[PDB]
Design an enzyme around this catalytic site. Structure first.
Site, PDB file in Angstrom:
ATOM      1  N   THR B  39       5.590 -27.554  -6.406  1.00  0.00           N
ATOM      2  CA  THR B  39       5.358 -26.888  -5.190  1.00  0.00           C
ATOM      3  C   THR B  39       6.431 -26.822  -4.028  1.00  0.00           C
ATOM      4  OG1 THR B  39       3.983 -26.329  -3.281  1.00  0.00           O
ATOM      5  CG2 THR B  39       3.633 -28.308  -4.483  1.00  0.00           C
ATOM      6  N   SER B  46       0.407 -24.059   1.968  1.00  0.00           N
ATOM      7  CA  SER B  46       0.558 -22.619   1.280  1.00  0.00           C
ATOM      8  C   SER B  46      -0.423 -21.535   1.766  1.00  0.00           C
ATOM      9  CB  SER B  46      -0.041 -22.810  -0.315  1.00  0.00           C
ATOM     10  OG  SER B  46       0.992 -23.638  -1.146  1.00  0.00           O
ATOM     11  N   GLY B  53     -11.209 -13.346   5.864  1.00  0.00           N
ATOM     12  CA  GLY B  53     -12.133 -12.666   5.710  1.00  0.00           C
ATOM     13  C   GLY B  53     -13.085 -13.162   4.937  1.00  0.00           C
ATOM     14  N   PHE B 121     -17.278  -5.954   4.446  1.00  0.00           N
ATOM     15  CA  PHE B 121     -15.586  -5.789   4.192  1.00  0.00           C
ATOM     16  C   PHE B 121     -15.249  -4.303   3.910  1.00  0.00           C
ATOM     17  CE2 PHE B 121     -13.316  -9.198   5.558  1.00  0.00           C
ATOM     18  CZ  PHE B 121     -12.176  -9.560   4.771  1.00  0.00           C
ATOM     19  N   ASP B 223       9.639 -16.209  -5.393  1.00  0.00           N
ATOM     20  CA  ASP B 223      10.535 -16.674  -6.303  1.00  0.00           C
ATOM     21  C   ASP B 223      10.048 -17.129  -7.516  1.00  0.00           C
ATOM     22  OD1 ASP B 223      11.667 -17.711  -3.516  1.00  0.00           O
ATOM     23  OD2 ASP B 223      10.353 -19.371  -3.242  1.00  0.00           O
ATOM     24  N   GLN B 242       0.562  -3.475  -0.315  1.00  0.00           N
ATOM     25  CA  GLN B 242      -0.660  -3.404   0.703  1.00  0.00           C
ATOM     26  C   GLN B 242      -0.071  -3.413   1.946  1.00  0.00           C
ATOM     27  OE1 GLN B 242      -5.001  -5.330   1.357  1.00  0.00           O
ATOM     28  NE2 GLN B 242      -4.610  -3.611   0.154  1.00  0.00           N
ATOM     29  N   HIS B 244      -1.690  -4.061   5.454  1.00  0.00           N
ATOM     30  CA  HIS B 244      -3.007  -4.448   6.188  1.00  0.00           C
ATOM     31  C   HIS B 244      -2.972  -3.762   7.752  1.00  0.00           C
ATOM     32  CE1 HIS B 244      -6.405  -6.564   7.675  1.00  0.00           C
ATOM     33  NE2 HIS B 244      -6.549  -7.307   6.634  1.00  0.00           N
ATOM     34  N   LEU B 254      -2.303 -11.856  11.573  1.00  0.00           N
ATOM     35  CA  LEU B 254      -3.317 -11.037  10.889  1.00  0.00           C
ATOM     36  C   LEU B 254      -4.774 -11.185  11.619  1.00  0.00           C
ATOM     37  CD1 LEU B 254      -3.842  -8.953   8.343  1.00  0.00           C
ATOM     38  CD2 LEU B 254      -5.136 -11.176   7.495  1.00  0.00           C
ATOM     39  N   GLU B 257      -9.947  -8.174   8.482  1.00  0.00           N
ATOM     40  CA  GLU B 257     -10.621  -7.138   7.997  1.00  0.00           C
ATOM     41  C   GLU B 257     -12.212  -7.696   8.506  1.00  0.00           C
ATOM     42  OE1 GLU B 257     -10.631  -5.512   4.052  1.00  0.00           O
ATOM     43  OE2 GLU B 257     -10.174  -3.668   5.337  1.00  0.00           O
ATOM     44  N   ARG B 288      -8.046  -0.322   2.828  1.00  0.00           N
ATOM     45  CA  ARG B 288      -6.875  -0.470   3.565  1.00  0.00           C
ATOM     46  C   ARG B 288      -5.507   0.554   3.558  1.00  0.00           C
ATOM     47  NH1 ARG B 288      -8.374  -6.552   4.157  1.00  0.00           N
ATOM     48  NH2 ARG B 288      -7.516  -7.623   2.126  1.00  0.00           N
ATOM     49  N   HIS B 355       1.376  -6.887   3.608  1.00  0.00           N
ATOM     50  CA  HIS B 355       0.284  -7.861   3.664  1.00  0.00           C
ATOM     51  C   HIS B 355       0.038  -8.474   2.313  1.00  0.00           C
ATOM     52  CE1 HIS B 355      -3.323  -9.997   4.759  1.00  0.00           C
ATOM     53  NE2 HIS B 355      -3.884  -9.490   3.483  1.00  0.00           N
ATOM     54  N   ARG B 400      -5.329  -3.290  -3.335  1.00  0.00           N
ATOM     55  CA  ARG B 400      -6.239  -4.459  -3.389  1.00  0.00           C
ATOM     56  C   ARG B 400      -7.543  -4.517  -2.783  1.00  0.00           C
ATOM     57  NH1 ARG B 400      -5.535  -8.906   0.334  1.00  0.00           N
ATOM     58  NH2 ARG B 400      -7.645 -10.005   0.004  1.00  0.00           N
ATOM     59  N   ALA B 403     -10.990  -9.200   0.292  1.00  0.00           N
ATOM     60  CA  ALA B 403     -11.723 -10.222  -0.167  1.00  0.00           C
ATOM     61  C   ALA B 403     -11.665 -10.612  -1.890  1.00  0.00           C
ATOM     62  CB  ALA B 403     -13.095 -10.459   0.432  1.00  0.00           C
ATOM     63  N   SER B 405      -8.721 -11.105  -3.389  1.00  0.00           N
ATOM     64  CA  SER B 405      -7.441 -12.105  -3.789  1.00  0.00           C
ATOM     65  C   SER B 405      -7.720 -13.561  -3.892  1.00  0.00           C
ATOM     66  CB  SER B 405      -6.170 -11.411  -2.955  1.00  0.00           C
ATOM     67  OG  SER B 405      -5.025 -12.000  -3.544  1.00  0.00           O
ATOM     68  N   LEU B 406      -8.379 -14.069  -2.774  1.00  0.00           N
ATOM     69  CA  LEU B 406      -8.901 -15.374  -2.867  1.00  0.00           C
ATOM     70  C   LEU B 406      -9.610 -15.524  -4.288  1.00  0.00           C
ATOM     71  CD1 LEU B 406     -10.210 -16.436   0.499  1.00  0.00           C
ATOM     72  CD2 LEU B 406      -7.981 -16.983  -0.598  1.00  0.00           C
TER      73      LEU B 406
END
Ligand SMILES: *Cc1cc2c(cc1C)nc1c(=O)[nH]c(=O)nc-1n2C[C@H](O)[C@H](O)[C@H](O)COP(=O)(O)OP(=O)(O)OC[C@H]1O[C@@H](n2cnc3c(N)ncnc32)[C@H](O)[C@@H]1O
Ligand SMILES: C/C=C/CC/C=C/CC/C=C/CCCCCCC(=O)OC[C@H](COP(=O)(O)OCCN)OC(=O)CCCCCCC/C=C/C/C=C/CCC
Ligand code: HEM
Ligand SMILES: CCC/C(C)=C/CC1=C(C)C(=O)C(N)=C(OC)C1=O
Ligand code: SF4
Ligand code: F3S
Ligand code: FES
Lengths: 129, 613, 249, 153
Positions: B39, B46, B53, B121, B223, B242, B244, B254, B257, B288, B355, B400, B403, B405-406
């Site tokens: 990393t 990161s 959200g 959301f 990368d 996306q 936002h 940010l 949302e 979004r 975003h 997307r 909530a 993507s997490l």
């Protein structure tokens, strides 16, 4: 070229593995407690020494002050006498220096209470001028 | 000059220490593989740690909920560009994945019954669309990416993964189409490390920094996608950036949302809740891609707010003092620091910001990187996996979900280790490295490091950021786009006139940032040309000149009594961009959107419909 | 037109026996963003690409950009530039760290000390992983507010003279605060052997109550209150126990 | 006896010493604040007294020239009562402060009054309070040695 050596894992702490044969429970907890109660016990004594004087206070000023200062200079010495900057053995000397200091403290006070005017009269006489 | 090379050998290597990366790292770790994590920064730094959200899972801690509605809401938001098996996998395993996090330590905000709290959301609903406004979004108040990431990073210390921190990944190691490791730079001392492994996992996150303005880290340079391109893998759906709805106008921090799904709304310079207009049903909780265009019109048409009339207002001040503090504490403070605003008394100045990247390295439902031919299906790439935002299993189609993507990180990370544990037999020995192993990667560094040109890295990047913003914007048109693709491809020329200064090896900020400009360009060029050639409007992609959504059928009528438009004439297809790094030349190609679910018995594929919120 | 001068700490490990120096840069305040990081990214983009510092989020949530600006450890990214230009401002790295190059400290000791506390969740009866959430009451969880927020930026530690003299033996504010986050998390079954890991004369008791840690913390967190809370447990007072999962959970 | 981390940490130091990396500026550059200067003071007072109690006791043993003969090897050096009473202050103040603050610092140890306002009220209250009590104890007995030098009766 890509013709070079094999390297190893970077220095990294592994908190499970190093945890294995390193279980010891020698707690400074119970000591730190007392030396605060002792400092808190000393609270009323300091203003008492402003009022009630003579030869018996002189002795427990010396007494209780010796012991507080003992646990005191020991912490100030761990701090400024660390082995990183003094080398390993000159530093152990400063630890032992600590005791010599605690012990000459009392000798010297005892003496002054026993042969000169005592702490409290000493205070008086400087305050008289 | 000369360089010192260090070989290592691991069962699996992960490029990336974010949400996804760390979950792969710990999963493989616990199932007993010798795992190296590479990393470019300390894991906690990161981008996942910026997330706010929360994370969707049908715990139904707030009210009854079925995991299938989430699959529903997912498939919709993806404007049927999402692969319904991936979105299948994602949304099934969500409930487990998020519960794990609670179990790992992650300190979610709490209901009175003492289960995970959930807020509402952007763009979700009970009952396969009919029901209500959903409450599926689980969260550590305001700061969920942060707390999630930390919990994962802590947890990864319990599973003996070996951490190569501040090492910059240069290229994947390819042996005749197989992936045998990674070659990275070690910033702390100048040393070059080839890592050999049975499996690589590229989990390196997005490329916001491609645009002049974004919500992402300085550290999002794509990368990983660069590493894919560069090892001959084509990337898909790059055109779906996306936007936002709510980035602070000046800086582009940010405002989550969440602040919406808790009560807050958008206002125009007439003090109108204009989201009632653009989305009668969902109001301020539309997707979004929609909510954003909605804001961008209100601007275009003079209803813009401010000194120059060019942002809108997010308003929360109507909400109770207590709720603002317990449910959104971290934006209250960042609104104040960056846009002087007290959120109990005034509105936050906001404007849509680049975003998230649905786009990425293609992968099947298993998260295994894939190349694709028209004639011979899609070929797996052996040894390679990719997950999190840098990937495209496309659980996200063209847009997307808030909530998700997490989740898509946590879940498919977990799905990497599970899928390796399964199929990595303890016979297959660590690949050997081929001769010449990653030489042209150090050869680039060297030339980039001594780069004498007359355009400083700092300048090239800027105009690529500033152009990408004007041409690959929220609303796009062919005459600006094809204009754009021109400027862009002149920039990939300017890379020959690249000037650097810091000529050192031990921690070179100038140098890594130049490597990053190299990587960014590949990302940005492919993006812009795919953006250009897509003559339609789907999810976040909005052609003003091809306003319609072009599918095989016209899903506005009854369907019964229509001919299928042939593959080549409609647009319901992933966009594959192949690039030659050397030359910068892109060629397109297209890949069919998987419609099947994983278990036609477990859950029913959702056939395209018209996308209204 | 208003010109702010900065004094940036400098060091090149690559140069034969080079010494840290202090460099002065001028920055046109009206062509720069509001925060220090912005000056910092300006002067590396326009004047001197060799200026070196860590940075990521730009909203002060990652921790990377931590450093010493005008005498205090704080985050560059959210540190307002002193608008007054008669004052000359100095950027220095985190106090008492070994420097890698320029404003970049060797961060590892602090990370390992972090590792030492085992910052993950343990229970006495091993759990069937993704199967149910643990019970924690809302009241119980808010014990963690002021504690999960930590960004591991290291300003607190880097400001504490105890940790300046003993970073090897004393664990420092950042790490302890965190240890405490795990000994009061009502779902963790290790208060006992957690406290046991830091029982000696140094790792925790070397907090000489100085106060810098709390006064500096760019997130308005109070690690001292935590350290002091840790001292109490290592001696007198007790870790409350779990209010049982009421059937239905 | 070092914990496993305490060990790791020393090797860390030895590593970082071997790599010749400078240590980043600290007490020279860090901004004087009420936090570390009052702690700083609490150290110094505490030590200075102890240091006197040594050179005092031990010095008046190991030497002839005793305290009584010394208490006026200086009274015989005609010096004004302000200079004199300022010295008494400087004698008295360490004691006032170190005690007062000592009770403060114990509070800290119980996690008590640890927030920035509470840190700073105490820093001032303890500080000033101590300098009052040290002025009380020095001006008042110089009050009566004028209230009786030119007394009403
Ligand atoms: C930008 C953003 C995204 C976001 C959000 C708020 C912001 C500001 N809030 C979210 C939310 O509340 N809920 C949700 O579901 N998503 C939210 N998002 C989107 C999402 O959080 C992130 O975009 C996504 O989680 C990113 O995680 P991921 O694991 O995919 O990638 P990463 O966290 O950005 O980490 C990347 C890692 O890769 C390493 N890296 C990168 N390049 C290299 C090279 N050159 N060599 C070696 N390593 C590399 C990085 O160092 C990093 O660890
Ligand atoms: C530079 C460093 C120099 C310092 C050297 C000091 C060695 C430390 C001595 C420790 C013990 C002191 C207590 C006794 C004492 O002060 O004597 C009374 C005397 C009275 O004489 P006298 O003979 O009565 O006066 C003669 C005429 N003036 O002393 C005084 O005049 C000084 C009074 C001390 C102030 C006390 C602070 C109390 C804090 C309040 C506490 C709160 C909560 C309860
Ligand atoms: C009279 C009541 C007193 C109280 C309640 C008290 C309290 C304390 C406390 C709580 C500490 C811990 C300091 C730390 O670790 O930061 C301390 C330290 C110390 N004390 Fe006292 N003290 C008193 C009197 C004295 C006196 C009169 C002396 C002079 C001989 C003295 C000498 C010291 C020394 C040398 C330290 C060293 C620790 C350091 O500064 O870090 N104490 N005291
Ligand atoms: C050698 C320099 C002496 C000095 C005043 C150092 C700074 C310092 C100060 C200022 C303290 O308050 C304190 N309690 C220490 O010990 C943990 C210190 O080391
Ligand atoms: S306690 Fe504060 S200063 Fe220290 S690491 Fe945490 S956030 Fe940073
Ligand atoms: S400054 Fe250090 S002394 Fe304790 S109060 Fe903070 S950790
Ligand atoms: S860059 Fe994230 S804290 Fe400064």
């Amino acid at each position: 070229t890509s013709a070079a050596v094999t390297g190893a894992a970077p220095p990294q702490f592994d908190p499970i593995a190093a945890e294995k044969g390193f279980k010891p429970l020698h707690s400074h907890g119970t000591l730190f407690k007392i030396e605060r109660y002792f400092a808190a016990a000393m609270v009323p004594l300091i203003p008492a020494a402003y009022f009630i004087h003579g030869r018996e206070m002189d002795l427990c000023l010396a007494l209780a002050l010796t012991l507080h200062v003992h646990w005191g200079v020991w912490g100030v010495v761990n701090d400024y006498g660390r082995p990183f900057v003094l080398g390993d053995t000159l530093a152990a000397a400063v630890r032992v220096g600590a005791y010599i200091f605690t012990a000459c403290l009392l000798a010297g006070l005892l003496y002054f209470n026993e042969h000169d005017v005592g702490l409290t009269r000493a205070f008086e006489m400087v305050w008289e001028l | 000059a000369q360089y010192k090379v260090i070989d290592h050998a691991y069962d699996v290597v992960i490029i990336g220490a974010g949400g996804a990366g760390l979950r792969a790292a710990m999963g493989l770790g616990e199932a007993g593989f010798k795992t190296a994590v590479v990393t470019k920064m300390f894991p906690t730094r990161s981008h996942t740690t910026a997330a706010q959200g929360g994370i969707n899972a049908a715990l139904g801690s707030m009210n009854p909920d079925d995991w299938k509605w989430h699959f529903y809401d997912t498939a919709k938001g993806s404007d049927w560009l999402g692969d319904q098996n991936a979105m299948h996998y994602l949304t099934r395993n969500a409930v487990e994945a998020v519960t794990e996090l609670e179990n790992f330590g992650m300190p979610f905000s709490r209901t009175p019954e003492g289960k995970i709290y959930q807020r509402s959301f952007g763009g979700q609903s009970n009952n396969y669309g009919k029901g209500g406004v959903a409450k599926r979004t689980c969260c550590v108040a305001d700061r969920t990416g942060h707390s999630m990431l930390h919990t994962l990073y802590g947890n990864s210390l319990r599973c003996h993964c070996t951490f190569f921190i501040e090492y910059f990944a240069l290229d994947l190691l390819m042996d005749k189409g197989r992936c045998v490791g990674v070659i990275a730079l070690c910033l702390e001392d100048g040393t070059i490390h080839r890592f050999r492994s049975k499996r690589t996992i590229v989990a390196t996150g997005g490329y916001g920094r491609a645009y002049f303005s974004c919500t992402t880290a300085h550290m999002n340079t794509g990368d990983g996608t660069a590493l894919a391109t560069r090892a001959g893998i084509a990337l898909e759906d790059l055109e779906f950036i996306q936007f936002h709805p709510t980035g602070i106008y000046g800086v582009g921090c940010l405002i989550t949302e969440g602040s919406r799904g808790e009560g807050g709304f958008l206002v125009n310079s007439e003090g109108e809740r204009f989201m009632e207009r653009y989305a009668p049903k969902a109001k301020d909780l539309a997707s979004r891609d929609v909510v954003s265009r909605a804001e961008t019109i209100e601007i275009m048409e003079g209803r813009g707010v401010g000194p120059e009339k060019d942002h809108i207002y997010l308003q929360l001040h109507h909400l109770p003092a207590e709720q603002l503090h317990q449910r959104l504490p971290g934006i209250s403070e960042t609104a104040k620091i960056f846009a002087g605003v007290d959120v109990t008394k005034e509105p936050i100045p906001v404007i849509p910001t680049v975003h998230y990247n649905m786009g990425g390295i293609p992968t099947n439902y298993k998260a295994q990187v894939i190349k694709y031919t028209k004639e011979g299906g899609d070929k797996i790439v052996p040894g390679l996996y990719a997950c999190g935002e840098c990937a495209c299993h496309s659980v996200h189609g063209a847009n997307r979900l808030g909530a998700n993507s997490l989740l898509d990180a946590v879940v498919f990370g977990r799905a990497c280790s599970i899928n390796i544990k399964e199929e990595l037999k303890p016979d297959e020995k660590i690949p050997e490295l081929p001769e010449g192993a990653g030489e042209e990667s150090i050869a680039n560094l060297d030339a980039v490091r001594y780069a004498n040109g007359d355009v400083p890295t700092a300048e090239l990047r800027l105009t690529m950021q500033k152009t990408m913003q004007k041409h690959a914007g929220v609303f796009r048109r062919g005459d600006i786009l094809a204009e754009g693709v021109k400027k862009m491809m002149d920039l990939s020329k300017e890379l020959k006139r690249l000037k650097t200064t810091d000529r050192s090896l031990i921690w070179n900020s100038d140098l890594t940032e130049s490597l990053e400009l190299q990587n960014l360009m590949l990302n940005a060029t492919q993006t812009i040309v795919a953006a250009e050639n897509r003559k339609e409007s789907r999810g976040a992609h909005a052609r003003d000149d091809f306003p319609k959504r072009e599918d095989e059928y016209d899903y506005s009528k009854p369907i019964e009594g229509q001919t299928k438009r042939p593959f080549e004439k409609h647009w319901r297809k992933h966009t594959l961009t192949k690039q030659d790094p050397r030359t910068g030349h892109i060629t397109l190609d297209y890949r069919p959107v998987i419609d099947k679910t994983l278990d036609p018995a477990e859950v029913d594929w959702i056939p395209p419909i018209i996308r209204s919120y | 037109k208003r010109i702010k001068t900065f004094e940036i700490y400098r060091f090149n490990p690559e140069e034969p026996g080079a010494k840290p120096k202090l460099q002065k840069f001028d920055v046109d305040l009206d062509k720069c963003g509001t925060m220090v990081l912005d000056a910092l990214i300006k002067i590396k983009n326009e004047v001197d690409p060799t200026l070196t510092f860590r940075r990521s989020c730009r909203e002060g949530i990652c921790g990377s950009c931590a450093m010493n600006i005008a005498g205090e450890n704080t985050l560059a990214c959210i540190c307002n530039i002193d608008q007054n230009t008669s004052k000359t401002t100095k950027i220095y790295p985190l106090p008492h760290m070994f420097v890698i190059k320029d404003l970049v400290p060797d961060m590892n000791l602090f990370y390992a000390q972090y590792a030492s506390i085992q910052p993950w969740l343990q229970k006495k009866t091993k759990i069937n992983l993704g199967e149910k959430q643990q019970y924690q009451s809302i009241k119980e969880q808010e014990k963690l507010d002021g504690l999960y927020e930590c960004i591991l930026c290291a300003c607190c530690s880097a400001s504490c003279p105890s940790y300046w003299w003993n970073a090897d033996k004393y664990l420092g504010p950042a790490v302890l605060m965190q240890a405490y986050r795990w000994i009061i998390d009502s779902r963790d079954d290790s208060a006992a052997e957690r406290l046991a890991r830091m029982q000696d004369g140094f790792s925790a008791f070397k907090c000489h109550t100085i106060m810098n840690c709390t006064k500096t913390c760019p997130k308005h967190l109070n690690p001292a209150r935590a350290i002091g809370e840790i001292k109490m447990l290592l001696t007198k007072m007790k870790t409350k126990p779990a209010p049982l999962p009421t059937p239905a959970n | 006896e070092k914990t496993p981390i305490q060990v790791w940490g020393w090797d860390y130091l030895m590593r970082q010493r071997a790599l010749k990396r400078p240590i980043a500026p600290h007490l020279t550059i860090y901004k004087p604040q009420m936090t570390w200067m009052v702690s700083g003071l609490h150290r110094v007072t505490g030590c200075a007294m102890a240091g006197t109690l040594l050179i005092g006791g031990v010095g008046f043993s190991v030497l002839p020239l005793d305290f009584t003969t010394f208490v006026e090897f200086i009274r015989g050096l005609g010096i004004p009562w302000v200079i004199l009473d300022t010295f008494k202050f400087i004698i008295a103040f360490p004691i006032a402060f170190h005690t007062l603050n000592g009770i403060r610092f114990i509070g800290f140890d119980m996690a008590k009054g640890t927030d920035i306002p509470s840190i700073y009220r105490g820093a001032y209250l303890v500080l000033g309070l101590a300098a009052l009590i040290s002025l009380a104890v020095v001006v008042y007995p110089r009050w009566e040695r004028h209230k009786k030098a030119t007394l009403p009766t």
